Symmetry: D4
Subunit: 81 residues, 8 copies
């Protein structure tokens, strides 16, 4: 299961969150960004349940995460060169 | 220069736009997604001027692209495993 | 009176809120969802006043409810097969 | 495969879109609504590919459909009474 | 039945739409405004069905209306001094 | 000086905020509403400074007021019947 | 009268719009930008009527302007070093 | 490096935040505004790294700053008369 998750942090907590994210195997990329969202992660998990558990029970429970917006990727419309 | 671009298309045009983007050398990854955005692209250009020229004169002049939201990725806070 | 309520939760609270909602008689359906909203609920109440009281005094007083967006359904433009 | 799709129509086209939506078998419920969205549909498709195809090539190609926001429902966190 | 409708217009059409709205009996007040919305209107109709018909068939069929967001007012939580 | 202010409260505090708002002389009308906003107020102040001060130091300091969106009404494009 | 106006253009029309904006005396600054808006202008006009006329009758009528969001600046809370 | 930052504060904190920002040498202009954002700041830093460090460790660690939206200004599409 694949998704891109847009994260907003508490004001000023973006670097600390990025640091946490780096260590997790399900996070295949992570970037802090300018604009309306603060961090963009690509998440690859073994199943849709494991994606859900990861989003709800890890990412959304990390210190200083405020909100997440998970964009489920369409199977067959996804390319990483 | 690196950025993630959140694209909205005209309703129904997402597959057409996807296929256009995939063949562009500045586009390193592209995904159709469920939610408030339709396509997520990661763009890598040689310079910020070349990123601007790519976003404005290629991506945003594609048929059926309605809007774009470019998130400039912060140098030194960007990991692809 | 009937409505669909889009709920946002505090980060990580969406399963808990989902569980509280599921057991309430006015809730005819409830779903955790990916994207900009966390929980969608269909509410059926005997009147508009009881809809009001349910939204404000039950839904919006649940722990870890951050926001709600109640969409009143139009009488005569509503089908459940 | 199940989703709740939030639709905006071109101004004034909501009743016509509603009537088109109601006769589709993948649409198990459809409601015109007050607020920032115009119609709410629950879609039940046999698979995630059939969901994508119904969203992109049916819903998003209907006349007067301006935008959609598909919310993928979380398996195991979904109840219709 | 009563509501406040937030209207967005096509760029440059807000004075024209304002003028069409002003003369209609269901409109009890109307204002062009700065910000994310263009026009605020208070609507008072004899019933919820007539509210519906007014929003969809008058407001949303006005030339240069792009979008509307109708906020139904809660009975018993409404004061005009 | 006239404005329409859209208020969001902390979840569940809308009735308490409404009662506080209704006794203020600068508030000429106040309504709790369904949708993305929770309360709508029209504010009439003697001047733009008095508007600012009432928005910042009264409304935005009320307990359970989370955010406001003040829409400055355009002089000459405003009618209350 | 002072304001900052956030402009969204038709996809790809941002440079052409920026070029138009440069020539107008009421526009004291203009910038194209990455993210959810496309151009940021500072507008200084002689009065609130002249601000309104400029926004509605010039900026919002320019080719390829799609939307504008005008943020009225608070007198006494405005500094340009 | 140049950017315009759209700031939201805790309700009522806008004047406090304004006064904090005004004295910072990276802040070249600052305005409190009516609407969906509360403060607009223009930031000029010597480098993109210094912009990031300024946004994350100064602006977004100010008391009562709730969120920020940094719009990176496009080099060569930026005029201050
Ligand atoms: C460093 C950027 C931060 C996190 C935020 N997204 C902003 O645009 O202000
Ligand atoms: C499980 C998904 C959570 C609730 C949130 N809606 C997201 O998209 O990240
Ligand atoms: C009938 C309601 C329409 C479709 C729209 N959602 C509004 O709130 O104005
Ligand atoms: C196939 C998904 C489409 C593109 C849209 N983003 C939606 O959620 O409805
Ligand atoms: C006159 C204002 C126009 C209508 C728009 N609401 C803006 O803020 O730019
Ligand atoms: C009673 C309605 C509340 C305040 C909120 N606006 C909602 O739509 O859920
Ligand atoms: C004084 C204005 C405040 C900061 C807010 N932006 C509002 O519009 O309500
Ligand atoms: C050049 C940037 C354009 C205009 C747009 N704001 C974007 O972020 O895609």
């Amino acid at each position: 299961a694949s998704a891109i998750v847009l994260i907003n942090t508490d004001a000023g907590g973006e670097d600390e969150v990025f640091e946490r994210l780096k260590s997790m195997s399900e996070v295949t990329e992570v970037h802090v960004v300018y604009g309306v969202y603060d961090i963009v992660v690509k998440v690859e998990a073994d199943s849709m349940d494991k994606l859900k558990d990861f989003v709800t029970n890890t990412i959304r429970k990390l210190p200083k995460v405020r909100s997440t917006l998970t964009m489920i990727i369409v199977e067959g419309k996804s390319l990483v060169k």
